[PDB]
Design a protein around this ligand. Structure first.
Ligand SMILES: C[S@@+](CC[C@H](N)C(=O)[O-])C[C@H]1O[C@@H](n2cnc3c(N)ncnc32)[C@H](O)[C@@H]1O
Length: 245
DNA sequence: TCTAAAGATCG
DNA sequence: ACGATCTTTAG
């Protein structure tokens, strides 16, 4: 069981076993909401199509892939005891937001993810990262996870685009796994998008393309994924919607 | 999920 | 320039 090098919400590590158990077999795996890519790191497809709306995220993934050794050596320099304090953090955060170099931003991005408050990723309407200092004892530099990501990424393509466009890339030999932002328990992921995602899923399964969707087990998710074989996992339970052709 | 301060929106 | 009400910001 492999871990990602990034702290990221929606890490489905406790549910990885349940996901792989319902995930159909295929040649290519498509992930419209790849995030930390825990599913990508713990499956075994011959090729992957990985996408996310976060441009900083996708940019990092490309750099780690194409320029692995150069990146690891550069990013490791920021994981020294001297950098674990507020003043250094807020200057590095300011350097990230003012940098126009993809490589430097990707290097600082890992630092901010490991030293930032609760590993959050928050922006303002200007696209500026504004997560405060995290105050951890000693942040772990995920060197092993980085190299393992780069190796598996050799069979993956990273795109920065909405789910509708990424799911449009899926063909006959493709399996689509969707891990959308959690449905509410009653710039966010609106209810209309939640419903639209299920609609696109029904379109793919009508074209003989397998689609698996994970989400909370609420009334809305039941109504959204009504045309799928629902599976309940595990307060609020977890739901798996399988669209089998 | 929290909040004080600053900006946005309308008639 | 007013003022109530959100909206945004960032620790
Ligand atoms: C809940 S996270 C899941 C991450 C991933 N499953 C993991 O293991 O880390 C959902 C991700 O989808 C991305 N996302 C949000 N809205 C999107 C949209 N409208 N289209 C495509 N991706 C989106 C977000 O950037 C977020 O990282």
């Amino acid at each position: 069981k492999n871990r990602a090098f990034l702290k990221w919400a929606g890490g489905k590590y406790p549910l990885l076993d349940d996901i792989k158990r319902h995930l159909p077999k295929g040649e290519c795996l498509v992930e419209p909401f790849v995030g930390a890519g825990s599913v990508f790191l713990n499956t075994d497809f011959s090729r992957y199509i990985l996408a996310d709306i976060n441009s900083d995220l996708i940019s990092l993934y490309n750099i780690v892939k194409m320029r692995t050794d150069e990146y690891v050596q550069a990013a490791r320099e920021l994981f020294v005891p001297e950098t674990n304090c507020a003043e250094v953090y807020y200057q590095f955060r300011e350097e990230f937001n003012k940098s126009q170099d993809p490589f430097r931003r990707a290097v600082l991005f890992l630092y901010l993810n490991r030293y930032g408050y609760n590993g959050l990723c928050r922006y303002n309407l200007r696209g500026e990262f504004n997560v405060p200092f995290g105050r951890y004892k000693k942040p772990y530099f995920p060197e092993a996870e980085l190299y393992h990501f780069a190796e598996k990424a050799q069979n993956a393509f990273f795109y920065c685009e909405s789910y509708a466009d990424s799911m449009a890339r899926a063909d006959d030999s493709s399996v689509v796994y969707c891990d959308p932002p959690y449905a509410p328990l009653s710039n966010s992921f609106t209810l209309e998008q939640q419903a639209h995602l299920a609609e696109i899923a029904e379109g793919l399964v009508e074209r003989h393309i397998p689609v698996l969707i994970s989400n909370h087990d609420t009334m809305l998710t039941r109504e959204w994924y009504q045309r799928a074989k629902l599976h309940v996992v595990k307060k609020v339970d977890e739901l798996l919607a399988l669209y089998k052709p």
